[PDB]
Design a protein around this ligand. Structure first.
Ligand SMILES: Cc1cc2nc3c(=O)[nH]c(=O)nc-3n(C[C@H](O)[C@H](O)[C@H](O)COP(=O)(O)OP(=O)(O)OC[C@H]3O[C@@H](n4cnc5c(N)ncnc54)[C@H](O)[C@@H]3O)c2cc1C
Ligand SMILES: Cc1cc2nc3c(=O)[nH]c(=O)nc-3n(C[C@H](O)[C@H](O)[C@H](O)COP(=O)(O)OP(=O)(O)OC[C@H]3O[C@@H](n4cnc5c(N)ncnc54)[C@H](O)[C@@H]3O)c2cc1C
Ligand SMILES: Nc1ccc(C(=O)O)c(O)c1
Ligand SMILES: Nc1ccc(C(=O)O)c(O)c1
Lengths: 391, 391
């Protein structure tokens, strides 16, 4: 089989790129190792920048989002007794963010694709990339027991952190930057009303706590836990008690608890690979970089990467300007580093780190006091939070 | 001998407090271990916040300053090839800073005092504080070979980092926060024209470099060096070569070099003691806290401490409200922590740290890129730099 752009991975990166390209006339084929259910089993993100909200409307897949996604104009940071709200809409110059589950976005895009009739091969085993530097690179995979071959012009590595794309680029060509945090987040999804109309990021001596929502009858919560904790050790009861212990008393007593729908511990990490391409292979989303979830930048960076890749391929196919595709990494890395710096900051001022002396405790505390107190400080949180502009 | 407020140390803290109090009718006595020449031999600071510029005018010692001090409306940060200017006057809402040597300030205040006829005992040896919690505390010292006794109501510990005041408060009463940096600054004063009309803070792979001035025919420079470097190893020649190597080529070739008047290596440190008082003893300036010089906050925090101590003693003596003097530490520590956080930040984004991995290099670089590029970011540097308001 032949195609123009072969897409590895059917996560939101791949589905979004595949959807945008299809709509532009560029035929693409998606290869996914798992089944649609497995992909839809992932809870992950819930906060979307205005830029992605527009990319979806552009991909033509926004009906449901316009209806169910929630527009927010502020967040709340809670520390040392106090709860401080950040008015995003006025501090950013009118921008806001939309809360809409990642699982929903995937579900929508997945519906959109199936109806379009565009090719999607789920259960594609042992995918291998070949001739990345030639004019005709190709992909081999197994469907059942038959090794098939797919010829294409370009390959988009949207297969996430442990995908095959990044491992296909010769090591000596990529320079890796990485930071592993000594903690993870134990997340939880539950069919209960959220405790707040806006999100609450809480710094507490016992660790970080997050109060989020997916809808008016569905909440998403998380608490920082050591990397040594196994999820089967945290009963629902244990979670809510721990959650209540880390929140402001006035919030903890408004909390409507309930049985969990999903629970899992995600480890924290920062990871950037430079550059993000090799010959005719271009990396996007988690295949190239990882940011700790504290800043909600993961899904959002995948969308911006994809937005840039889509727009550079339109020009190459449509305007014959394949030279522009060399600019890909440079354009993406500028955003990527800014977002990695903001995600890192958010993480360091809201989380409790082990083995921290008195001076750093006081500085973390003061970082919060200064930033939530200054008008200039709040603005840096706001403009970064709603997401910096696309270049 | 008796007095109302005994002042230990004749540095700018002591002289300023002593001058303000004298003018208010409150009699004070200053005790200095060294000689006036030794004190005037110290080069130290050169940048003053508007708040101190006003405190001096209030202490009535500003004629010379109004004439020789230089008002600046911007600074320049130079990194990775580029040189970015920060317009302080518009980003802070009209504030600026004054460049005027610390040695000058001391010299002025010292002239003012001698003419006032107020008591100053230079060469006061082996000073000891007694009865700090009684109603009549006292100070003993030796002048030549005679141990004299000074009775007073209150004692102001303005004796700097290694003074006797802080060691007089029972250890179990103070909680100490401290950070020692793995480097120091090798400073240099020279009778040459400065290379810039505004200061230049430079981040370079070889380390930090600073271009400052004391006047139109006098410059002050500094370069970050390891803690293992002895000043006698750095000839003047060696300094300028090193300085030129760390600056932008366009600046390095405008540099007018020359023989040094002064040279010395000052180690970097962050230090805060809580609280800043014990009974009838109140700590001020370096006696209580140390900030790395990167943010120019040292002399400025001494002035604000002194401003608060002076104003709380006016109320006690003048209005009989000695209860207010309990509020001293709390008022001072708020400013102190904000300034310690800003000085720490400045230090971490302009200095080269040993044993730093790739990720942190990129973050330091991006911290600079984001802050010098955002309008909100530049404002946080500006408002902090010109100095936050006095409470
Ligand atoms: C474990 C994890 C937890 C996260 N949790 C959060 C969170 O709590 N909150 C938040 O804000 N962000 C979170 N994120 C980030 C966010 O979910 C991601 O940034 C976003 O899902 C990435 O989209 P993607 O398309 O780049 O990758 P993914 O969602 O990982 O999709 C990648 C696709 O690659 C497919 N695939 C993998 N290898 C192969 C292969 N060799 N061949 C074929 N197909 C392959 C995968 O099955 C998957 O469909 C999380 C990310 C991870 C990895
Ligand atoms: C080594 C050093 C270098 C510095 N360099 C810089 C710099 O390069 N740039 C910058 O911006 N800031 C610098 N500073 C900070 C700035 O110079 C200080 O913040 C400011 O001088 C402190 O004023 P002070 O009155 O609190 O202390 P000081 O200037 O230290 O004055 C304290 C006084 O205490 C007297 N004394 C000490 N012990 C006794 C005693 N037991 N009895 C009697 N008298 C005593 C001392 O002789 C001195 O006169 C430096 C500080 C230090 C300590
Ligand atoms: N930082 C954030 C904010 C919201 C969510 C969420 O799942 O709602 C998250 O996973 C991380
Ligand atoms: N950070 C700064 C700025 C100026 C001076 C100076 O001496 O001129 C300094 O010592 C430190």
């Amino acid at each position: 089989m032949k195609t123009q752009v072969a897409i590895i991975g059917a996560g939101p990166s791949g589905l979004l790129l595949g959807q945008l390209l299809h709509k532009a006339g560029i035929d693409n084929v998606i290869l996914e190792r798992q089944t649609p259910d497995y992909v839809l089993g992932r809870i992950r993100a819930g906060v979307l920048e205005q830029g992605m909200v527009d990319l979806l409307r552009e991909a033509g897949v926004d009906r449901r989002m316009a209806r169910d996604g929630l527009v927010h104009e502020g967040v709340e940071i809670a520390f040392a007794g106090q709860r401080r709200r950040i008015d995003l809409k006025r501090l950013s110059g009118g921008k806001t963010v939309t809360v809409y589950g990642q699982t929903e976005v995937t579900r929508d895009l997945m519906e959109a694709r199936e109806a379009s009739g565009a090719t999607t091969v789920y259960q594609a085993a042992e995918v291998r990339l070949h001739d990345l530097q030639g004019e005709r690179p190709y992909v081999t995979f197994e469907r059942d027991g038959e090794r098939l071959r797919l010829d294409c012009d370009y390959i988009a590595g949207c297969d996430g952190f442990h995908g095959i794309s990044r491992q296909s680029i010769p090591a000596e060509r990529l320079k890796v930057f990485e930071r592993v945090y000594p903690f993870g987040w134990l997340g939880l999804l539950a069919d209960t009303p959220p405790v707040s109309h806006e999100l609450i990021y809480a710094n507490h001596p016992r660790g970080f706590a997050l109060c989020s929502q997916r809808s008016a009858t569905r909440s998403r919560y998380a608490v920082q836990v050591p990397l040594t904790e196994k999820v089967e050790d945290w009963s629902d009861e244990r979670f809510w008690t721990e959650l209540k212990a880390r929140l402001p008393a006035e919030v903890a007593e408004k909390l409507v608890t309930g049985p969990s729908l999903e629970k899992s511990i995600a480890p924290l990490r920062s990871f950037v690979v430079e550059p993000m391409q090799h010959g005719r292979l271009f990396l996007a989303g988690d295949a190239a970089h990882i940011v700790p979830p504290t800043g909600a930048k993961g899904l959002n960076l995948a969308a911006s990467d994809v937005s840039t890749l889509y727009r550079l391929l339109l020009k190459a196919y449509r305007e014959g300007r394949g030279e522009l595709l060399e600019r890909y990494s440079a354009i993406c890395l500028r955003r990527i580093w800014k977002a990695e710096r903001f995600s890192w900051w958010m993480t360091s001022v809201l989380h409790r780190f082990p083995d921290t002396d008195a001076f750093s405790q006081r500085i973390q505390q003061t970082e919060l006091e200064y930033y939530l107190g200054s008008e200039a400080g709040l603005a840096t949180i706001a403009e970064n939070y709603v997401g910096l502009p696309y270049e």
